[PDB]
Design a binder for this molecule. Structure first.
Ligand code: SF4
Lengths: 273, 273
């Protein structure tokens, strides 16, 4: 079973890409488990069709004593992807590290990690690279990490910080699988992300273009692969999925020093002096 | 002395709004302290003109046998605004809340909360409402909270969760000052957010329009007020500033039940069934 996590700054379509990537991968005869570990993102709604599936932690906190049933917290979606949302911390009190480990622990007990699974995906928040949101990596639940980024200053800064945390758990086998660029239609965006990925010791595994059909598919509460299998953007995600599935270039990332990261921002006009 | 924090989902220009708001407030004869508590936001770069000012935590780890000079971590920028960055956690290991605790404490010890300050602003991450990022509220250091949101479901979801933390610590004195809308140029955005704010018991403090002057200012390392004092968008931030400064409606918010928040999305066409 492949054990993948997607990290990245919020607000640039990381959850859209994860759901479209998993949808595309399911059409290749893959059994996929998707666990949302991002308390600001609906990581499964394009695959399930609703809004905000009942989360593991909300179920656990809810009134009553009866034991959780797997069917409560794991719902089948497009392509047969099993969909789970861990849920957020108790507002102002809890910690997402304990919440994420709590959800995974309970999923393990209920048998969600079935022997016929080809992939498990974690969609993890990447806006803070704290010990809590790194627990999927630290505990070896996710060994193969992909970072969604865009040609924006703090999106690349976030990715670099994720790489620092990722590098800290290299001994356990965690690797960077590659950078995924969510096109913000910035000039030279692909060139910049290719250069960033190269300095990390990795590669831009795919460039995901802006296409209005993604907003149309989401308005219809679906992934692009589901909304229009033969569309161009659907072929993009299929390329992305093919590249992930057959990716054999996994590395311990080498995060950029601050002066090199800032220099690259000047070089590609992201900031003008 | 006003003690204000700005929370919100990331990726919708919250920190743009924070830096432009404080800039606009400095033109009104105000002495302001600005503390970045958001590890994916360069919360001071548009007031200082550089990139990633040296953080309190980086200064502490590099500390020598001597102490620490306030000028190392606190730097004056546009309008005379004192600018500080806490710094994120050690990637993958640390808790971001302890970094925020430590930086505020260090600012206290070195006397940065001077008698002539009119405002201190905390630019706080709001993508996870954990115990760590609640610390400016819990610790009594931030008493007047504004939330940046847009007409997107998870942006309003995120604000609703922030309000749950805020209400939980009402006896400590923290209050919701209002919602600020960063317009994503979607239909009925202002109407939806005005309804959201009313259901919380608050109000929409200002509707901030999408405007390419903003991207122009920031690529040139500036706020809009600085980049073009006579700009239209500058006048918008000045109105926001006047609204915040004169705001006398601070409430304990009443967060919306899940079904009521989803209903609001359907009512305003944000979600189509
Ligand atoms: S470790 Fe991370 S998620 Fe947990 S409380 Fe600290 S900042 Fe929040």
């Amino acid at each position: 079973m492949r054990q993948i996590a997607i990290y990245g700054k919020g607000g640039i379509g990381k959850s859209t890409t994860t759901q479209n990537l998993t949808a595309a991968l399911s059409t290749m005869g893959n059994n996929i488990l998707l666990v949302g570990c991002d308390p600001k993102a609906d990581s499964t709604r394009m695959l399930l069709g609703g809004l905000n599936q009942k989360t593991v932690l909300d179920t656990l906190r809810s009134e009553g004593d009866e034991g959780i049933d797997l069917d409560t917290v794991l719902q089948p979606g497009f392509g047969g992807i099993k969909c789970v949302e861990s849920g957020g911390p108790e507002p102002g009190v809890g910690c997402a590290g304990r919440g994420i480990i709590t959800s995974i622990g309970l999923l393990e007990n209920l048998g969600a990690y079935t022997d016929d699974l080809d992939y498990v995906f974690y969609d993890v928040l990447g806006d803070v690279v704290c010990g809590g949101f790194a627990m999927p990596i630290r505990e070896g639940k996710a060994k193969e990490i992909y970072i969604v980024a865009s040609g924006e200053l703090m999106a690349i800064y976030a990715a670099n910080n994720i790489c620092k945390g990722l590098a800290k758990f290299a001994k356990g086998g965690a690797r960077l699988g590659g950078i995924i660029c969510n096109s913000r239609k910035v000039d030279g965006e692909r060139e910049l992300l290719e250069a960033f990925a190269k300095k990390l010791g990795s590669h831009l595994i795919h460039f995901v273009p802006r296409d209005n059909i993604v907003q149309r598919a989401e308005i219809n509460r679906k992934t692009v692969i589901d909304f229009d299998r033969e569309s161009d953007q659907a072929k993009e995600y299929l390329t992305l999925a093919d590249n992930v599935q057959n990716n054999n270039k996994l590395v311990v990332p080498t995060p950029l020093p601050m002066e090199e990261l800032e220099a690259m921002m000047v070089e590609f006009g992201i900031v003008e002096l």
